[PDB]
Design a protein around this ligand. Structure first.
Ligand SMILES: *[C@@H]1O[C@H](CO)[C@@H](O)[C@H](O)[C@H]1NC(C)=O
Ligand SMILES: *[C@@H]1O[C@H](CO)[C@@H](O)[C@H](O)[C@H]1NC(C)=O
Ligand SMILES: *[C@@H]1O[C@H](CO)[C@@H](O)[C@H](O)[C@H]1NC(C)=O
Ligand SMILES: *[C@@H]1O[C@H](CO)[C@@H](O)[C@H](O)[C@H]1NC(C)=O
Ligand SMILES: *[C@@H]1O[C@H](CO)[C@@H](O)[C@H](O)[C@H]1NC(C)=O
Ligand SMILES: *[C@@H]1O[C@H](CO)[C@@H](O)[C@H](O)[C@H]1NC(C)=O
Ligand SMILES: [Ca+2]
Ligand SMILES: [Ca+2]
Ligand SMILES: [Ca+2]
Ligand SMILES: [Ca+2]
Lengths: 572, 280
């Protein structure tokens, strides 16, 4: 038992006599034992869940399902009931109907009342003689014994105007309009899994006007579909090799289901994924994430929808390097039909050796905090959740000149000039360092050779030089003076364009590959005089756009910066 | 007309009314409920409203939803009352519109991370503070300005800055977003305010109740800055369809109610005719 709709519609007037039939109802059964009873709610509901009075004018026939008028109407009862609307205009009342307020356990019936009386038969258009204002829309389960769910006629219309010749007509369809009785029935039991929608055109014919009205039919679903693989895939092989992060999607698969019925409120409570136990290392390092998505599939030239569940497999912690294992994981799927999944996971350890000797040089004219070379593992861009730190050990322990800091983006170290005087000495000209590549989580480490040659000559800078490269504004004063961060000893000039506010802003940097890079690395952020145009937290004078954590993202004209006041200027 | 703040004022001045109010509040938050109901149907708390932009609107709504008994429509607790270039120029020549305009822009145009595009709650707070205390001849002129080409429609779409507030990574279910909006006090009251003033009608000539364009426009613009915050769908010059950031997917057997809930924003002749007649 279920109501075919949730809203029936009826127009009322003043002084309609008793015994006037109002409307029909329909309640299609589910089992061959069910008889539709119809009981009425004992309150004339007004607007927004407000009781007005008990029903005392409308009675019902439970057998034919006939709402009709028990008593007559007047102006006095309706002006009485309009008072209790509490500041709202009386436009539509409604009743509640039980059967054995929500569909399908209850059905509310609307009544749109007019303060005027019943107009004449010829004073009404046949569009207002055939069908109501609210075009219907029905709710039908799948795979149920069909019956009668709708009737066409307007009962007070033909009850008060019987002399108007009116016909109704429907156009391999299971639906049918019977002759000599304008009830609508359905031949066979239907399924949404074949087709979900049935829109039709019902034709009313008066004397003379032919009126076409749309007629939608919606089919509802039951859980008639076990979970199904797309094509035979039951397992998924994956290797946890380089990432080892707290959370990375390891394995991914799809499962088809034509059942839609466990919707998003109760979707967690019905479609169950269960990691089968057996090792505590899996339960401390793995989990299964699950969500569906609706897709549209074709059945007989139509487009119905179904659920494609996606099961992915997620890590739980930072896996260390020393893991040298493999497992098979088993997954239960419950579509409350019972499905099993597998995952061959292989967690392979990582070698941490380096090339043994990093032969390189450095010019003598360089200044403090100038980048030279890069120390890194053979797989630089493979590490995700493993911290690798770099240090130095000078051999003579007397000629300390250089240092290494580690960026955790690439997990790699960058050489920087720490001292000027030790590089300035002709004694410490070829230096031998033990670059030791360490680790934080598990103390596996390695080491390597660093030979560096102090090469070139030394020339003093100018008399009025500032301490940073970005103080200069023109091109000549940039390269004829030496700032801090450059390993060349002089500052470099990059020249932009006249295309307005661009990223290509003309400036003076230490290195044209490092300072206007758009990234503030570990080297530049040590002391804020090196690269102010990538690492400042300050104010900008001129049309520009600042960087996303910090810095100048785009400028106009020439851009110089005073890092002593955290101020920058941009002007052609 | 007694608002719920003064209704609580007259409620706290009496002993029986306060007793039945706290009794029904302990009931909701048989016979104890029904006696309190049949007493408090004559209270000043009964049929108390609130105001738009009033001081302590939150307490008024928390009092009003406290007496409410536990559904597509609900009762509104309120008083039932180049062109876009010129709109922005008329804003920036006044001082009150300029300050709050630059306030919500400089809040909502601040990217934090490459993942987090903007901060959500501060942007909504700035947009609510903009659309509460600005005179409505400035808000309606900038949000509703008649266009003929694509660039004007793009400026009109970018006015509430949808890159931070409106769009998200996904379009969730409209029914779930309705449940989230009806969980909160303020969003549920603004949604009931929109439902009471912007339904379609078969009797009135403009399909709007009381033929009131102003109440439907105020009920529209009062939803800005919540999770159910609508905007335009594209940069169409003449085609004007507003929509919240959701869709009909994931509906299950609740598809028809989701479509009917979405047709309030997509296919409302009342709201579209109100926008068109305001544009004339
Ligand atoms: C679901 O599938 C549609 C297909 O176009 C896609 O756009 C959407 O991102 C998918 N959503 C999820 C959560 O997978
Ligand atoms: C991992 O274990 C296997 C077991 O035979 C061994 O052969 C292999 O050398 C181990 N991995 C490393 C990096 O030592
Ligand atoms: C699936 O869930 C239902 C609901 O609790 C339960 O009765 C059934 O036993 C479950 N399936 C399995 C294989 O346990
Ligand atoms: C997963 O491991 C099992 C264990 O023998 C094996 O039979 C199966 O073929 C493996 N899966 C794949 C895709 O090779
Ligand atoms: C995992 O490693 C990352 C790498 O930096 C680290 O930031 C994070 O705190 C680690 N988390 C855990 C739970 O170990
Ligand atoms: C650079 O030199 C200073 C002073 O000699 C010292 O404190 C600092 O630790 C050095 N840098 C590194 C990375 O060792
Ligand atoms: Ca079926
Ligand atoms: Ca299923
Ligand atoms: Ca199904
Ligand atoms: Ca840089």
């Amino acid at each position: 038992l279920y109501f075919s709709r949730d809203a029936y519609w009826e127009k009322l007037y003043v002084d309609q006599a008793a015994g006037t039939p109002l409307l029909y109802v329909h309640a299609l059964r589910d089992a061959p034992e069910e008889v539709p009873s119809f009981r009425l709610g004992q309150h004339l509901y007004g607007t927004y869940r407000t009781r007005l009075h008990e029903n005392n004018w409308i009675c019902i026939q439970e057998d034919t399902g006939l709402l009709y008028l028990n008593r007559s109407l007047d102006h006095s009862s309706w002006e009485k009931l309009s008072v209790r609307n509490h500041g709202f205009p009386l436009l539509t009342v409604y009743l509640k109907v039980f059967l054995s307020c929500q569909w399908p356990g209850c059905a509310r019936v609307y009544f749109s009342f007019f303060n005027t009386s019943f107009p004449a038969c010829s004073s009404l258009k046949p569009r207002e003689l055939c069908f109501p204002e609210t075009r219907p829309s029905f709710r039908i389960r799948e795979n149920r014994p069909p019956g009668t769910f709708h009737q066409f006629r307007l009962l007070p219309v033909q009850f008060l105007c019987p002399n108007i010749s009116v016909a109704y007509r429907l156009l391999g369809l299971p639906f049918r309009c019977a002759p000599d009785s304008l009830e609508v029935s359905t031949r066979w039991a239907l399924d949404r899994e074949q087709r979900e929608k049935y829109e039709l055109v019902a034709v009313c014919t008066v004397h003379e006007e032919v009126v076409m009205v749309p007629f939608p039919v919606t089919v509802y679903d039951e859980d008639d579909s076990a979970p199904t693989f797309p094509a035979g895939v039951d397992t998924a092989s994956a290797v946890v090799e380089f990432k080892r992060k707290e959370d990375t999607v390891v394995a991914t698969l799809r499962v088809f289901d034509a059942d839609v019925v466990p919707a998003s409120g109760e979707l967690v409570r019905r479609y169950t994924s269960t990691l089968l136990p057996g090792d505590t290392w899996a339960q401390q390092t793995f989990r299964v994430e699950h969500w569906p998505n609706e897709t549209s599939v074709q059945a007989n030239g139509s487009f119905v929808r179904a659920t494609v569940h996606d099961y992915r497999l997620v890590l739980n912690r930072n896996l260390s390097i020393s893991e040298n294992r493999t497992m098979q994981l088993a997954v239960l799927v419950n579509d409350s039909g019972v499905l099993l999944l597998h995952f061959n996971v292989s967690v392979l350890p990582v070698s941490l050796h380096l090339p043994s000797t990093y032969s390189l040089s450095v010019s003598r004219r360089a200044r403090r905090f100038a980048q030279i070379g890069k120390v890194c593992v053979e797989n630089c861009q493979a590490f995700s959740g493993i911290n690798v730190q770099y240090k130095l050990h000078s051999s003579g322990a007397n000629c300390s000149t250089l240092g290494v800091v580690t960026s955790a983006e690439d997990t790699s170290g960058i050489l920087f000039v720490n001292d000027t005087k030790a590089l300035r000495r002709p004694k410490c000209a070829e230096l031998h360092y033990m670059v030791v590549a360490t680790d934080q989580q598990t103390s596996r480490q390695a080491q390597a050779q660093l030979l560096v040659t102090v090469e070139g000559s030394y020339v003093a800078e100018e008399a009025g030089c500032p301490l940073s490269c970005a103080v200069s504004k023109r091109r000549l004063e940039c390269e004829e003076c030496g700032g801090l961060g450059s390993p060349t000893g002089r500052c470099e000039w990059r020249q932009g364009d006249g295309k307005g506010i661009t990223r290509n802003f003309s400036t003076c940097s230490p290195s044209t590959k490092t300072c206007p890079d758009g990234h503030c690395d570990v080297v530049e952020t040590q002391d804020i005089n090196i690269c102010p145009q990538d690492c400042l937290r300050g104010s900008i004078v001129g049309g520009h756009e600042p960087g996303e954590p910090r810095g100048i993202k785009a400028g106009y004209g020439t851009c110089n910066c005073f890092p002593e006041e955290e101020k920058c200027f941009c002007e052609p | 007309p007694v608002d719920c703040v003064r209704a609580n004022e007259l409620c706290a001045a009496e002993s029986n009314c306060s007793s039945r109010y706290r009794t029904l509040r302990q009931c909701l938050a048989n016979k104890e409920c029904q006696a309190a109901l049949e007493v408090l149907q004559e209270s000043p708390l009964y049929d108390c409203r609130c105001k738009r932009g009033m001081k302590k609107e939150l307490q008024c709504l928390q009092i009003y939803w406290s007496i409410h008994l536990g559904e597509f429509y609900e009762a509104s607790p309120y008083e039932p009352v180049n062109h876009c270039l010129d709109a922005a120029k008329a804003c920036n020549l006044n001082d009150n519109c300029k300050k709050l305009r630059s306030s919500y822009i400089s809040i909502c145009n601040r990217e934090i991370s490459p993942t987090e595009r903007c901060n959500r709650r501060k942007c909504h707070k700035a947009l609510r503070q903009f659309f509460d205390r600005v005179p409505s001849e400035y808000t309606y002129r900038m949000l509703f300005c008649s266009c003929q080409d694509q660039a004007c429609a793009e400026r009109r779409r970018q006015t509430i800055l949808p890159s931070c507030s409106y769009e998200d990574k996904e379009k969730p279910n409209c029914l779930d977003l309705r449940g989230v909006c009806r969980t909160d006090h303020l969003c549920r009251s603004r949604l009931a305010d929109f439902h009471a003033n912007c339904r379609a009608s078969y009797q009135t000539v403009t399909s709007c109740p009381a033929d009131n364009y102003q109440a439907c426009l105020g009920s529209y613009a009062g939803m800005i800055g919540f999770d159910m915050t609508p905007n335009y769908v594209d940069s169409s010059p003449t085609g004007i369809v507003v929509s919240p950031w959701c869709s009909c997917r994931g509906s299950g057997n609740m598809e028809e109610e989701c479509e009917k809930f979405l047709r309030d924003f997509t296919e409302n002749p009342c709201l579209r005719n109100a926008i068109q007649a305001f544009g004339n």
